[model samples]
Target chain A: CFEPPPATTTQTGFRGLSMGEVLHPATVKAKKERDAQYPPALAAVKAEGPPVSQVYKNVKVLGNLTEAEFLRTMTAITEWVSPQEGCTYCHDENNLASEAKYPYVVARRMLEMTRAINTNWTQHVAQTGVTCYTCHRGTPLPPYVRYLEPTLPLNNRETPTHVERVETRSGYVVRLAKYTAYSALNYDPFTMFLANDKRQVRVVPQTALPLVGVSRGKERRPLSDAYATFALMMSISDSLGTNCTFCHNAQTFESWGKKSTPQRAIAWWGIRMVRDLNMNYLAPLNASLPASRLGRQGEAPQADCRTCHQGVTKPLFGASRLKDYPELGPIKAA
Target chain B: MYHGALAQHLDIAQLVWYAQWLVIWTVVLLYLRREDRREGYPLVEPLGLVKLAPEDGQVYELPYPKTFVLPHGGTVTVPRRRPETRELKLAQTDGFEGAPLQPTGNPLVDAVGPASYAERAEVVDATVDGKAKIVPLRVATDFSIAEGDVDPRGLPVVAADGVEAGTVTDLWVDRSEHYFRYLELSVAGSARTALIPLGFCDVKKDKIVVTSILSEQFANVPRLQSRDQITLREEDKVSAYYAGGLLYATPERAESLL
Candidate 1:
């Protein structure tokens, strides 16, 4: 029942200034001292026990990241992942620890996906290959769609059925990916380089080698791959949405989910798409352009501030549509 | 803790690879759309009413009432509004831009992403002294701190400026009053954790600051007799702790400072 003191901007013994100034040092010392003192790393903390460990994956995902980077990404995912954080979000320590059951298995699958991404980066690239920012690019969903509904006066409303589908033969949308949402704000500039028309804007080489040599072409592919990834994602999402437990088991998309039925075929197409786009187009383009123009210019892209930012400030709030999804809004901060 | 829930055969390296692209690409796609919107592109649009089932039953849409938008930069669709209601029922429904209606019987399946090879315990490890030790303590699944095992009295008292010395072992609360009771501290090397008077502590910027008092000094401090020992309830130790609503010290503070 007793509340802890408010966080103050003062310093402790080691540091002569305010605590804020020495926070980093204190944290460093605390980490070393605490790690030595308890040495609990040998035994995982089972304070809550079992399921709580499942949810703790969020922290494990970023344990190695710098505090600044960790906090930023945590907040970013909190926002971009949709529903910001709420009881229904099912990510708090209590939920992870308690016996309460979750209806779907996606929560576990999401953990798997995140684990996959984090491990790959740390093992292969160590530092540069890919990061949370590489693909997120500040958007929530990759294959973003916007549907229009015609409504009558007052209560009478005509509902638009916006169902996304995936073909088992080829995982592509089959239908052209439209930029209806892009029209609201001319996001074309940001995505222009990613388009297939410009070979420069594509994925880097498929080889797991460390990305060396700054090249405009390499930069272009990541941007282009971003779009391609979305195209593939749509199919994956659609596959999950249409088929029975065929794509995933119960609520979980087990390791075999990607290899099952329609999902198996679609995921294959998606992986190949990345390889083709990155190897053929992205790598060649990088070979042609200089490294200095990596993020800024390749084929003379547009100059716009709103590209990364939407609200008054850049890259904070406003890019989230998961917030718009009524079921997932009002997400509490982690 | 349930270990190895998924129990799937997977390559750790490959999973990591897929995960990295998933995050990177997802971000790229999402950010591209926002960037487009910032540039005055009309890629995003208001959410129109959407029906869940078209054939027979009342059309119920999981997304509820909200704006939907497409990314100008990538092949992404984003919902612009949060649905307040649980589920919305629609009388009629039409596919977007002539798209066919596709519905999977289960909603849970649609919520998740692709599954990978790693099991729950393989990649994740829990430790008692890990992240759970900080304020707002979070417990790792594999480890736990026994509630009654910690004896605050066993803690050694240290003399340092601006550092109040105290012990914290257990949390107590009065059911009727709905507040914490005094913290029980066990002096260093002692088998039992004793209750410390609240006035003996203060919270500082770095850690809990406690006023070190010799064993004899305990007599001078205001005391709260147990209900079993004294019939008369002289003072409401609970309210006295929060009198000022700021920095009010009492016996409870001394016991539960941490």
Candidate 2:
């Protein structure tokens, strides 16, 4: 359904040459000679006159543009967004200033959004920039537009070692010290599984460690805390429904070289991000939350790698929802 | 002669019983009328009873999902609700048996009830003296830590087990409280920086020591949502994480020491 049409063998423009080829000297001369048959218009519309605000009421985005410029820009916008309906797509024929139509209000906000993207978001859009034609093309709604959808829960096939329940005396049975398989506590921040997972995954503390470095003789010795660290990595992998290969190379796990894609760094940032959110945002709000709202340990609700990521690498398939809720601004940069 | 005699000899006991019955009937009718007048008796209004007259106050449906233009150039859709809505119904007393009848003045405190010692401990942006401002420790000379010759800034921060976590990048001094608030540490490997409260740390000559957690765990220290300032909520979380780390580090550590 998404496939494009087949390429044509025939060529028509600039002596059967493509746009790139037309830039050649020979093609340019031929194009100039062909252009002589159709002369340029002597009288063209000037995009400079009275201010746009003076010409039209409720003028917001194009207030700075001259009357001629305003008209020309509006005409171009109409052609790009609503060619069939023209001005009536966003404006009333009887009263252009009236905000009776929903499209007009949306268009106003869209214009502001466009200006914001062109002005601030230089990293993604770059100098080439974007306009109505970039997203809208010709349709009222963009074909690739994605609205906010409910996040689906992760399907963890592993059985829980401990079920979260309230106790008559102990208050809550949140974590179990001795149990096989994954538990709900695995998703909780109460355990430092990421830093030290020996207690979680291993039956007994092991002497051997997964050592990674250039010097095997000096650094080959077992790291005292390797078990906990690797266990935490496994927990994260399980949460995201992936394995070590997702962010690391199977051959050399230690080297942050070419084998390790940007995903490794992203995972590193994600670890800190989860910690920060759990510690800085969620945990503090415990005091403001009643016991009913708190976890079984009577602590504030905490988030882990799985909270936002769910079972996917990117939450909501990386759909940009900030456009729908501009008031949230952009997700804060770490 | 017989009719006159019958009229004169009235049944006194029957007359008294009839009067008592009439009194009982009148009381029953009055009670029923009073009960009918009570709120939500025969029929309850779908919306609500218009207690106030039109002159006193206006009562009208604003339509479902009414849109309001905020002062800040944005619109919000507020959902409509009637008295019949479940949310608007009187709260059931299932879990709130001994709950307070009156509010505790503080909304959060009232809502969450009293907090534990761990929950109460929050990182506020005030000096040790209870002033709400940030100042240099040297400037607040009254503090004993500031009077000392040792400047904790730029010193390497080490864990209790001697693992080097980071270098002291900056010192956050609470000007109002007249004490050092936090030590901003620039982690060794990553470009990220973490803020550790002075309460959880011990300042020394060669290096600063964090006894609450291991050096490896420092990588997971709670980060500030913003770069410039830390909100009260953010401070609470950061402080709680470090404090909770004492127990959360391991299950063996969580075993009751008492």
Clashes of each: 103, 5
Tens-digit lDDT track for model 1 on B121-168? 111111232221211111123323347543333344332233333345
**What does candidate 2's lDDT look like per residue over B50-122, in tens digits?**
4443332122212224477844345755432223332221233345545433222321222211211122223
Task: Indicate the worst ten consecutive residues by lDDT in candidate 1 chain A.
Answer: A147-156
lDDT of 2 at A219: 49
User: What ranges in model 2 sit over 4 Å off?
Assistant: A1-190, A193-224, A331-334, B1-258
Error of 1 at A29 (Å): 43
Error of 2 at A292 (Å): 0.9
- DockQ scores for all predicted structures: 0.01, 0.00
Model 1, A1-334: lDDT tens per residue? Answer: 6434442233221333111111234433443442232111111222232332233444432343444443344344443343334334444455543423331132333333334433332232222222222233333222121111111111112332233222232312222332212112222322332223343322434433333444346443345455554443333333222222323332322334332344344334334343333334333443333454222233311111222221111122222232212112122234
